């Protein structure tokens, strides 16, 4: 059971990281435009 909770926390962290990077890339393309 603790393994499932740790995996869920890792997945949430990775998803937040991916969203952050996507927003950064969007700002980069806006800057290039």
């Amino acid at each position: 059971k603790p393994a499932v909770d740790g995996a869920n926390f890792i997945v949430n962290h990775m998803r937040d990281q991916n969203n952050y990077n996507e927003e950064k890339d969007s700002w980069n393309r806006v800057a290039r435009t």
Binding site: P2, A3, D5, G6, A7, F9, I10, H13
Partner: peptide, 18 residues
């Protein structure tokens, strides 16, 4: 001991990420 190793590894990774 495989389940204990898995639990310890995953808990360490989660703690480090936090």
């Amino acid at each position: 001991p495989e389940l204990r190793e898995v639990v310890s590894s995953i808990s360490y990774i989660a703690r480090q990420l936090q």
